[PDB]
Amino acid sequence: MGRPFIIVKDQGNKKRQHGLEAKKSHILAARSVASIIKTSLGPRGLDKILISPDGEITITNDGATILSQMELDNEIAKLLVQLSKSQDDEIGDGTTGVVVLASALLDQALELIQKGIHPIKIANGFDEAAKLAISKLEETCDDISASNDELFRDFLLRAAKTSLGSKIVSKDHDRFAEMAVEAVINVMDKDRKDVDFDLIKMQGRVGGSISDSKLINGVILDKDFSHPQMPKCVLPKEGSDGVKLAILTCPFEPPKPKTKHKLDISSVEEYQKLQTYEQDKFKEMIDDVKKAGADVVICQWGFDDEANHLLLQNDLPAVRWVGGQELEHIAISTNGRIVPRFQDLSKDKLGTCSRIYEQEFGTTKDRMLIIEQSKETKTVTCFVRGSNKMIVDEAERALHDSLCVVRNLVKDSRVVYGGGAAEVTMSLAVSEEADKQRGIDQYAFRGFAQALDTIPMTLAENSGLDPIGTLSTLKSKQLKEKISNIGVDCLGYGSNDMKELFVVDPFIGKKQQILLATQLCRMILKIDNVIISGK
C-alpha cells in the first residue's frame, strides 16, 4: 500500500461526521434556528428582515418565508426549511410553532442519548406518546357544527382574529377580520361545504393606507383601456342591468392562417379586390358585437389602430393586452363563457357586471379595472393597500394566513383553544401515562411532555410573564379542573381563560404541529454518518 489512498472520488471536500459528538453537533445546531424565531412566536412576536442577493428586501415573522430564500449550509437546518414549507402548504398556519417544537424534541432527546439509550428507542417513544396526546385533545375538542349559520359566522371571526394578532395587520383586528370571512362565505355551499381556494384571488397595491383596504367582488386588472377618451364608468341603460361583457380570445386582426402562407396577387384587378375585402371585415366584426348587444370586449393581443376607434364610435369600450390567465377568472364571476370565434358569439356567452369604473392612483400613471357585483357571485378578490411596498406584501401573507385558518374550519368544524391551553392539556396526558407503565420508556415519555411545555413557556417569556409561575399555574387548573380552556395570556388580561378572550384555533392546524415535529426528529436521531461535500 502506497501513500495515495483513494476509494470515493473527491475525498478532500467530503468530510465524515460520526460518534457521540455527531449527535451533539446536529441537535445544538437545530436549536439555534428555533432560537431565532423563538421571539417571533405569539402576538408579542417580532418580525425578521430578509435580504435577497438581488437587493430586494422582505420583512416577515412567518417561519415559512424566513427559512425560505435563505442561504444555508448544514443539512439539518435545511430539513427545517422543508418542515415550515410542509406546515405552510397544507394548513397555511403554525409554521413557527412547529420548528420550535421540533427543536424542543431534540433538546430533550439530547440528554437521553448521553444516558445510554439508543436513539431509535428514544424516537420510538415519541410516536407512542404523540398518539396519546392527540386522543386526549380529541376527547375534549368541541364541535361547533351543531349550531346554525348565524353562530357559525362569529366562529370564523374567533379563528381569524387570533392569527392576525402576530402580524402588522394586528392594528385593527375587528375591521380586517370581516374581509377574510365574508370572502369565504360567498364560495361556501351551505352543505358539504368546500372552500375552493382557487376562486379566491389576492391582488395587492402599493400606496395609500391599510385602512383604505376594502373587499371587492370581481376582477382587478391593471391594463388600461385601448382608447383614452372612452368614459371611465360603465353603467347599464334601462333594464338588463348586465353590461353584456364579452370575452374573446381572438382580437380584431386581418384573418390569416397560423401556418406559413403566400398570397399571390395579379396586377391591378386582384389588388383592388382585396382592398374591399379587409374593409368589409371591420364592418363584419362590429356588426357581430352590435347584434349580440355586447359592450366591453377583452382579448390577448392589442387591437389594430383602425380597430381602436371603430369601437369608440359605437360606444363599445375595450381592453387589450390581457393575460391568458386573467381571461378565465373574469368569465366565472360574470357567469359567462369565453367566445372562441366571431361566428360563435351569442347572448348566452355574454357576461354580467354591476358597475365598472376606471381607477387612478395619485400622480403616477396607471389604470386599474374594477368589476363589481350587486349580488353574490362565484369569485372574490382581495384589495390591499399600504404605505410601504413591504407592508403591502406583509399584509398579503397576513391575509393569506387568515384565509388558511378559515378554510380549515370549513372541512373540519372541530376546533381547539390555543394560546398555551392545547399544549399543556396534551403535555400532562403523557406524564400521567409515564408513571403507570414505568419501564425503560418512561424517560422518552417525560422528554416528550417537557418538550410540549416549551411552547407555553415561550409565549409567557416574550410577553414578560414568568415562565415558572405561568407553567405551574396552568398545571394546577388543568389537573384539578377538567376545563382545558386555561392557557397562556400574552396580552395581560385579568383572566387566563382562552374562551372569554375569543381565541379559537383549528384542530387540524394544532394536530400537524406534533405530527410534523415528531416524524422529522425520528429521522434526525437515525442520522449517524454525515458526508458533506464542499462546493
Binding site: 420510538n124 410516536d127 425520528r522 429521522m523
Partner: protein
C-alpha cells in the same frame, strides 16, 4: 391450508424494519399488500406502482 392474504402481510412487515415505517407499519403495510393483489399474478410491474 392458510389464507393467501395473511401470507403477504407478515412478509411485508419484515422489510419495514430499519426504516421510518417500523412504528407506522400498522397503516402502511395494509397498503402495499393491496397494491400487489391489484396487479396480475402472471405479470408484475414496478412502473405501475410508481
Amino acid at each position: 391450508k392458510s389464507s393467501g392474504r395473511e401470507l403477504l402481510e407478515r412478509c411485508a412487515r419484515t422489510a419495514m424494519s430499519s426504516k421510518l415505517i417500523h412504528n407506522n407499519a400498522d397503516f402502511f403495510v395494509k397498503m402495499c399488500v393491496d397494491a400487489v393483489l391489484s396487479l396480475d399474478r402472471n405479470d408484475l410491474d414496478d412502473k405501475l406502482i410508481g
